[PDB]
Structure formats: structure tokens, C-alpha cells
């Protein structure tokens, strides 16, 4: 009683204090300002909705003794929220349940009592036409059910609450989605429930019929409204099609909705990565690595970066497939160092010319690369290893026996030492001839690449590029020009006095 | 006090980084560490050190003496403000807040130093405060805070000449330019070795001489070496007492290549066991080898590989794998033949090599302004 | 000692003598501009990144 009675009564009111201001101003604002006049293209409860996701991902942790969220559910679910005569008592109903928490015991929502927290769209003049109020007031209880996820019999409460959310969702799919941002607002709520909706199904359920309903959701996307159903319904489509991909990729090649042309700086950003691994796994390398880089350079200034740990790895997987290699620990972190230990040692083996060193790493972290889901792409690097060897030696020495390079490259065979270098001429890595009769490999001294067209080519790749970044810094410089109202020439009365004094000076 | 203060950090190196070598450092570093009232900077060095649980009372008598100097600052700060000589509290801790810099940590130092910076209207104490901030920025290697007070430092010397505050400053920029791998600038700050002084931090002038020759032998070419270090009497008379360094310089200038690797292994070994050079000892000799290879190899065109083992340094397969990784490293301009046993050189132009670093900096700055270009405007 | 430059052959003592400064003035003068401008962009954080 002293520890509970002194440590337990302040967990209600200060979360009550913030929740009288976050979703009560998002409630008072998003209802009368999306279902109201308009939420414009510069919406505010979209990003306010982002804040009322991200604070709530890290807001609830405990099983909610003293009803600090457990009493928020029977408070915030009894809501007409119809108009100021009906919400004018709801503003008291934000406070009357605080007498129920502080004075009495409320309904402790602990894994059993969520079903009597659901049928309130029937209760007390609650509707569905205000789906700015009922999709936000659907999600706002749909989130903390699945935020902890705490998999013990909550999957069906989550599930049926997602079914009521699917009643609101299908009502958006068919019923008056125009000029209210019903569809435009609930694409955000659609994707944000597709995250938890996704991870429950990845946890314990199937995956493949929500694919078909997702094809219906994409079917009704792009037709009635042409934003954000074009965007999120393709990463959220992709997320296990990659993990169960094969030929479907060509569908994403021929997809019209590859571009939504705007995807709010993060869905576009991870989107270019999700399609980057497509060309990575289906062997288009050089086209992949530039959208790997472009997908990398569009991520925020936050620290929890596991997907950036993934793209930081895969981004130079394909560059190791292409021979070029930068340094990767130039921004190394305590969350990046342990996840780069093995991988920097892998590319350390690749940047050497040794043969079985590749095996000395592949036995060491082949299971780690299976845990990375990349081992079938790791396995093909020995081609690039022997290209590194033949380019290194062919550049270094000039007249060397073929009965030395196989032993130095531990090839165990000089009889195909003619043959790998033969495909180095077929690939054109080295030019000059092998004295196949004698045994030595001569190489000419090809110098003066300075008198070639190619340094102008390496220029011309970059001339138009830096002109384009100048031009985009010109097109993006058209947002400050405003409030240039009155260009007064000189005056009016001073012009009249100039006419008077000028008339006096001419009068003299 | 901050004048013997660098030997402390050098002996923190000598404690920590050589694994086997950790006994005399916890002898003499304790010998200086639980005397002259040092309390704060060796608790984590005590974690890296042994248990030393007996030193609790040693910490208590010295937090007691630290409390004594603290409380007599607290005895000075009221008669000091009672009659105003020149902000006499800060005239007390303009000498005793540097004690507090040694004794306490950087914080009670820094607020008393940025505090006391506004007291002396002439820079004759300001620039000494800035020197103190330079030295503690070196100790905690505050590589951003040294950039501030180097500029704020240099902004004060132009009024006056203050060459005992400018060449003395060039010692600091020399030690930072050799702290980083900026050697052609490090010898350039180590240019004079004449106005340089019998220091508090290099109490051997001759250790400063060894430093400036070790950075000069990479930093400058033959014309410079064949006039500057070879004809300087002031640089000659101090390596006159050096048996190895005079040999190690003259083995390179006098084409004594075989012993040059021996003395090279000596100086590289001590450099491996040296503070402030142990960050770049491998960087040093990988430039020394390719430097000597450039020196001998850029004389002849048809000199064979087997010639160099007996006159240059032993190991034919060593010269094989050693030049092979340097041509393969894209430097050391020659082209070796193998199965007729001859080494051939060429000469490249100053075009493609000078082109290379231009496309490097162009791609680097393109990455920079591209990244910032995505940083601004969402 | 680079006061004269050329080559010296060992088999019979041949001195191929050659001289031209190809281009010296251009790429370095265009090069140090780049490292000025990099410092300028580093200064653009301290009026851009911290500011807005």
C-alpha cells in the first residue's frame, strides 16, 4: 500500500495530461479539419498522426495497473463525437472517467476485456460517415492492442478489431471517398495497420489471401484517387514476394504504379531499396547499385537503423560483384561495428588475390550469410576473385610463365591457366598474347590513356550531372518568393509638392 | 600545473597499449599520480590498471588536500572581491584554476578559463590561457576544440610580433600535424629548429631533432635534403651525438641500402613502441620502402632483379613479392619482367596521375554536396 | 640529384636524354579550388544544418 499508493497514482494523470492534448487536439482538429473544411495537400494531422504513432510506439510498456491505458480504453471508446452539442458533453467525458480511475476501479484491460471495448460504434450516437473520426478512432484503439504485440490470446482481439477496421476500411473502399481525404487520409491508416497486420501474419498466420485482397486494394487504387495507394501498396505488396520471389519481379518491371511521384521521403526511400534488391537478385548489377545508393541517401537522422544495416551491407555486395570497393566503416557505430565484423573481413578477403581465403571466410560466416539471406549471392564471387587475381598479376608482371601464376594463385592446374586468361581476353581484362608454345605470358606496355576519348567520357557523365543539380537548386529555389505586394514608385503627396515647388521654381 | 603534463599521457599510452609492458608505467605513473594532488584523471586508468583498493585512503587524503586548496580559494574569493585589485578572485584562479585543470577535470578548468578570459585586457595572459586549452585539448584529443583556439590563438599574435608566442605555437601545430598523418605540413611547421626551445614537453631538444628528421625524410625530396639537413650546422651538431640517426640519415643519402633496412627496422621498431607514432608506424615504413625503391629504381632502366639482393637488401623472393605488390599497388613506376630475370622501368607523364586525384576530389565533393543537397529542402 | 635527368644503361652505357614539362599550371590550380570549396561546404553546415 505505500509503494503502490505513492508510485502508482502518478502514472494516470500525466499520461492523461498528454492524452488530453495529443489525440484530443488531433481529435478536435482532424475531425473538424479533414471531415471539416479540408485538410489540404499541406495536411497537418498526417504528420501529427506520425507523431501520434511514434510517441505511442514507445509510450506503453507496462500491463497497465491503476488503469493508465486500461482505463483510457473505456473512457475514449464511449464517443458519439457528432457535433459541438454532442461533443460539448464529450469534453466532460474526457474528465468524468478520471473520477472513475482516481475514485473507483475501472475496467482493467488485461488480455480479456478488449471485446467490450469494441462494439461502441453502436453505442451512443457513434457513426461511420465521420471516418476521419472513426478511422482515427479505430486505429487509436487498434494501435496499442498490437504495439506491445504480447502474443497471448490477443491475436483474436487484434484480429476482430481489424475486422471492424475492415468494415471502416471497406466503407472507405466503396462509400464516399471524395473531397474529404477519406481515401487519402486512410491510406496512411491503411499502411500503418498493414504494418501490424503484416507482422501478426508473419508471426503466426498465413500470408497469401491478404495478397489477393491487396490486389483488390491496388485495383481500387490509382482509379478513384491517385495517391498513396499507388505507393504503399507496392512495398507492402513486395515484402514477402521478395522472400517468395521468382518471376513476379517482371511484374514490378511492367508495373505502371512504380512511380507515385511522391511518397513522403521514406516510403520512396525504402521503396528504391526494395526494388534495388530486385535487380540485385536478378543480376542487373550496375543499374541496381545506383538505386542502392539513392535508397541509402534518403534515410533520416535516427539511430535505430537495422534496415540501414541491411542496405549498408547489400549496397557493396553488388559493388563487390562489380569489382569496385569503397570503405564501409567510415561511419561505423556501436550498432554497425558488430554487424560489420564478419562482412568487412569478407570484403577484406575479396580485396586480396588469394583463392582459398574465400573458403576461409565462407566456412567461417557462411551460416551468418544464410542468416543475412544472401549466401546464394555470396557463392558467386570467385569469378570476381579470379578477375582480381588476373588483373593484379597481369598489371603487375610483364613476362611471366603460366606455370607460375597457377601456383601463386593456388589454382592447382597450369593446364587451364591458359583458359582463365583466355576468358580474360574474351572478357577483355588483359590484351596481349600468351606464348602458349613456350610458356610465358608477355604483356605490352599500353600507356597514355590521356589521349583517349574516355576521360572526356568520365567528364561527360558528370558535366550534365552537376548542371542538373544546379538546375534542381534553381527549381527548388521557387518557394521563398511571396509577400511582394506594393511597389510604390515614389509617392503621391510628395509628387504633388514636387509639382508645387517645381511650379514655384519655374514661376521664378 | 600543465608543464610536466604530457609525460602523464605518454605514460597512459605506455600503460595501456603495450600489453606486456605494463609494470614500470604503473610504477612511475603512480609515483607522479598520487602525488601533486592528482585525483580525477586516473579512475578509468585505475580500471585499466590493477585493483589498487588500498588507494582509497590515498584518494581521501588528497581529496582532503584538494578540499584544502578548494576551500582556500573559498577563503580568497571574499577579500579578493572586498578590495578590487583586478578581479582578484579570477586573479587567484587565473593561477589556481590551472591547478584545478590538473587536479580536477576539464569542466572547472574550462568555465574558469572562459570566465577568466574576460579579465586581462591584454593578451599576455589570454594567450597563455589559450595555450592551456590547446594542451588539454591535446590530452583529451579534443580535435574540434583545438581547431577553435588555434584560430582564436593565431588571431592574437598579429598585434605584437610575439615570436615566443608564434614559434612556440608552431611547436603545437607541428605536433598536431604529426599527430595526424600530415607530414609535409608537419616538417613545414618543424622548419626552424632554431627558435625552438628546450621545452617542457620535449625536454630533450634532440628528441625534437629526431622528430623533425623522421618527418623530413618523407616530407621533402633530394634537393631539399641535399641542402637543408645536410648543411645545417645547428641540425648537424645535435645528431652529432646521435650514432644511429646520423647513420640512418646518411645510409639513405649515401646510398647505403643494406644497412638502411637494419636501422629502418630499429627506428620502425621503436616507432611501433612509441606514443603518437604508433598510430602510423605501418604508414611510415610502407612509405620509406617505396621511397628508397623509387630512389634506386628511378636511376637505371635495365637493372636486373638479382642485382639488388646483395647490394640492396637480401631476399630475391622478398624483392619479388615486394615490388609486385607496389606495381600492383599502382605506384613505383616500372614494369618487371619475370622469366628472363630483368626489371624494366618507364617514365609516365604528369597527366593521368594528376588526373586521378582530380577525379577523386571531384567525386568526393560531388558526394558531399549531393548529400547536403538531400539534407536541406527535406 | 635531379640537376640533370635522363637514363643510364648498364649493358653498354646509353644515356637517353629527354625533356618536356607536359602540363603543370592547370590541374593543381583547378585542384586547390576544390579543397577550398569543400571547406566552404563545411561552413555551410554552420549556417544551414544547425539553422533550419
Amino acid at each position: 500500500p505505500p509503494g503502490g499508493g505513492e508510485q502508482e497514482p502518478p502514472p494516470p494523470p500525466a499520461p492523461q495530461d498528454v492524452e488530453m492534448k495529443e489525440e484530443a487536439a488531433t481529435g478536435g482538429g482532424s475531425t473538424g479539419e479533414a471531415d471539416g473544411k479540408t485538410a489540404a495537400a499541406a495536411a497537418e494531422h498526417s504528420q501529427r498522426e506520425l507523431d501520434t504513432v511514434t510517441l505511442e510506439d514507445i509510450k506503453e510498456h507496462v500491463k497497465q495497473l491503476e488503469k493508465a491505458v486500461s482505463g483510457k480504453e473505456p473512457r475514449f471508446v464511449l464517443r458519439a463525437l457528432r457535433m459541438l452539442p454532442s461533443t460539448s458533453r464529450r469534453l466532460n467525458h474526457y474528465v468524468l472517467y478520471k473520477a472513475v480511475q482516481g475514485f473507483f476501479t475501472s475496467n482493467n484491460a488485461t488480455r480479456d476485456f478488449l471485446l467490450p471495448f469494441l462494439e461502441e460504434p453502436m453505442d451512443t450516437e457513434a457513426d461511420l460517415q465521420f471516418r476521419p473520426r472513426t478511422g482515427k478512432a479505430a486505429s487509436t484503439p487498434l494501435l496499442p492492442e498490437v504495439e506491445a504485440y504480447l502474443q497471448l490470446l490477443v491475436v483474436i482481439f487484434m484480429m476482430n478489431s481489424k475486422r471492424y477496421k475492415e468494415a471502416q476500411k471497406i466503407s472507405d473502399d466503396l462509400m464516399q471517398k471524395i473531397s474529404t481525404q477519406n481515401r487519402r487520409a486512410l491510406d496512411l491508416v491503411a499502411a500503418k495497420c498493414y504494418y501490424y497486420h503484416a507482422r501478426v501474419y508473419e508471426f503466426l498466420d498465413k500470408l497469401d489471401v491478404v495478397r489477393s485482397f491487396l490486389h483488390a486494394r491496388l485495383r481500387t487504387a490509382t482509379l478513384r484517387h491517385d495517391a498513396d495507394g499507388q505507393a504503399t501498396l507496392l512495398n507492402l505488396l513486395l515484402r514477402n514476394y521478395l522472400h517468395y520471389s521468382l518471376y513476379d519481379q517482371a511484374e514490378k518491371l511492367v508495373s505502371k504504379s512504380v512511380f507515385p511521384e511522391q511518397a513522403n521521403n521514406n516510403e520512396w526511400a525504402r521503396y528504391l531499396y526494395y526494388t534495388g534488391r530486385i535487380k540485385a537478385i536478378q543480376l542487373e548489377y550496375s543499374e541496381a547499385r545506383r538505386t542502392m545508393t539513392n535508397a541509402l541517401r534518403k534515410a533520416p537522422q535516427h539511430t535505430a537503423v537495422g534496415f540501414k544495416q541491411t542496405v549498408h551491407k547489400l549496397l557493396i555486395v553488388v559493388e563487390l560483384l562489380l569489382g569496385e570497393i569503397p570503405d564501409r566503416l567510415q561511419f561505423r557505430q556501436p550498432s554497425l561495428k558488430r554487424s560489420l565484423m564478419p562482412y568487412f573481413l569478407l570484403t577484406q578477403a575479396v580485396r586480396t588475390g588469394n583463392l582459398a581465403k574465400f573458403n576461409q571466410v565462407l566456412d567461417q560466416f557462411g551460416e551468418k550469410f544464410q542468416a543475412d539471406g544472401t549466401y546464394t549471392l555470396i557463392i558467386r564471387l570467385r569469378h570476381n576473385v579470379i578477375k582480381t587475381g588476373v588483373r593484379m598479376i597481369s598489371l603487375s608482371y610483364s613476362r611471366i610463365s603460366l606455370a607460375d601464376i597457377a601456383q601463386k594463385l593456388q589454382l592447382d592446374s597450369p593446364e587451364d591457366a591458359e583458359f582463365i586468361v583466355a576468358k580474360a581476353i574474351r572478357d577483355g581484362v588483359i590484351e596481349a598474347s600468351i606464348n602458349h608454345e613456350k610458356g610465358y605470358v608477355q604483356s605490352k606496355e599500353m600507356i597514355d590513356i590521356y589521349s583517349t576519348r574516355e576521360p572526356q567520357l568520365a567528364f561527360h557523365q558528370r558535366i550534365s550531372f552537376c548542371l542538373d543539380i544546379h538546375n534542381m537548386s534553381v527549381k527548388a529555389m521557387r518557394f521563398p518568393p511571396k509577400s511582394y505586394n506594393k511597389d510604390l514608385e515614389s509617392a503621391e503627396e510628395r509628387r504633388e509638392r514636387e509639382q508645387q515647388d517645381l511650379e514655384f521654381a519655374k514661376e521664378m | 600545473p600543465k608543464n610536466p603534463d604530457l609525460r602523464i599521457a605518454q605514460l597512459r599510452f605506455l600503460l595501456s597499449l603495450p600489453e606486456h609492458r605494463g609494470d614500470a608505467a604503473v610504477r612511475d605513473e603512480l609515483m607522479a599520480a598520487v602525488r601533486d594532488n592528482n585525483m580525477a584523471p586516473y579512475y578509468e586508468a585505475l580500471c585499466k590498471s590493477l585493483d589498487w583498493q588500498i588507494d582509497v585512503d590515498l584518494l581521501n587524503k588528497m581529496k582532503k588536500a584538494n578540499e584544502d586548496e578548494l576551500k582556500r580559494l573559498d577563503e580568497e574569493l571574499e577579500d579578493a572581491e572586498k578590495n578590487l585589485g583586478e578581479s582578484e578572485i579570477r586573479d587567484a584562479m587565473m593561477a589556481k584554476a590551472e591547478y584545478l585543470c590538473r587536479i580536477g577535470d576539464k569542466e572547472g578548468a574550462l568555465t574558469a578559463f572562459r570566465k577568466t578570459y574576460d579579465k586581462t585586457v591584454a593578451l599576455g595572459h589570454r594567450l597563455d590561457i589559450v595555450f592551456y586549452l590547446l594542451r588539454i585539448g591535446l590530452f583529451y584529443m579534443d580535435n574540434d576544440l583545438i581547431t577553435r583556439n588555434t584560430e582564436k590563438a593565431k588571431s592574437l599574435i598579429e598585434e605584437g610580433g610575439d615570436w615566443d608566442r608564434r614559434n612556440r605555437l608552431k611547436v603545437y601545430q607541428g605536433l598536431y600535424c604529426v599527430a595526424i598523418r600530415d607530414f609535409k605540413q608537419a616538417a613545414e611547421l618543424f622548419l626552424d629548429t632554431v627558435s625552438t626551445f628546450t621545452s617542457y614537453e620535449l625536454m630533450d631538444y634532440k628528441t625534437f631533432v629526431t622528430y623533425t628528421v623522421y618527418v623530413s625524410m618523407i616530407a621533402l625530396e633530394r634537393p631539399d635534403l641535399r641542402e637543408k639537413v645536410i648543411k645545417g650546422a645547428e641540425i648537424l651538431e645535435v645528431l652529432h651525438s646521435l650514432p644511429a640517426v646520423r647513420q640512418y640519415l646518411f645510409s639513405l643519402y649515401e646510398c647505403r641500402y643494406s644497412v638502411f633496412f637494419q636501422s629502418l627496422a630499429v627506428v620502425e621498431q621503436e616507432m611501433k613502441k612509441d606514443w603518437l607514432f604508433a598510430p602510423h608506424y605501418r604508414y611510415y615504413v610502407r612509405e620509406m620502402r617505396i621511397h628508397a625503391y623509387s630512389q634506386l629504381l628511378e636511376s637505371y632502366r635495365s637493372l636486373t632483379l638479382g642485382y639488388m639482393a646483395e647490394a640492396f637488401g637480401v631476399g630475391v623472393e622478398f624483392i619479388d613479392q615486394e615490388l609486385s605488390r607496389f606495381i600492383a599497388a599502382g605506384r613505383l613506376h616500372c614494369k618487371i619482367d619475370k622469366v628472363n630475370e630483368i626489371v624494366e622501368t618507364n617514365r609516365p607523364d604528369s597527366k593521368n596521375w594528376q588526373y586521378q586525384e582530380t577525379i577523386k576530389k571531384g567525386d568526393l565533393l560531388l558526394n558531399r554536396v549531393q548529400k547536403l543537397s538531400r539534407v536541406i529542402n527535406m | 640529384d635531379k640537376k640533370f635527368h635522363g637514363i643510364l644503361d648498364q649493358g653498354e652505357g646509353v644515356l637517353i636524354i629527354f625533356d618536356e614539362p607536359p602540363v603543370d599550371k592547370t590541374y593543381e590550380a583547378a585542384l586547390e579550388t576544390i579543397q577550398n570549396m569543400s571547406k566552404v561546404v563545411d561552413s555551410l553546415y554552420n549556417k544551414a544544418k544547425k539553422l533550419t
Partner: peptide
């Protein structure tokens, strides 16, 4: 390549000069 390299930096610096004219005008005027 040098001139085209510097020109974009010029326009970038001007865009900084415009966003300072935006962000300290929207709150100030209202």
C-alpha cells in the same frame, strides 16, 4: 568541369539564403 562544379554550389548557397528568408518570415509575419 570546374565552372559547372562551382555554379551549383553558388545556387545552393542562394537557396540557403532563401530558406532563411522563409523560416524567419512565416513565424514573424504570421
Amino acid at each position: 568541369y570546374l565552372a559547372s562544379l562551382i555554379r551549383s554550389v553558388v545556387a545552393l548557397h542562394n537557396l540557403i539564403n532563401n530558406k532563411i528568408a522563409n523560416r524567419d518570415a512565416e513565424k514573424k509575419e504570421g
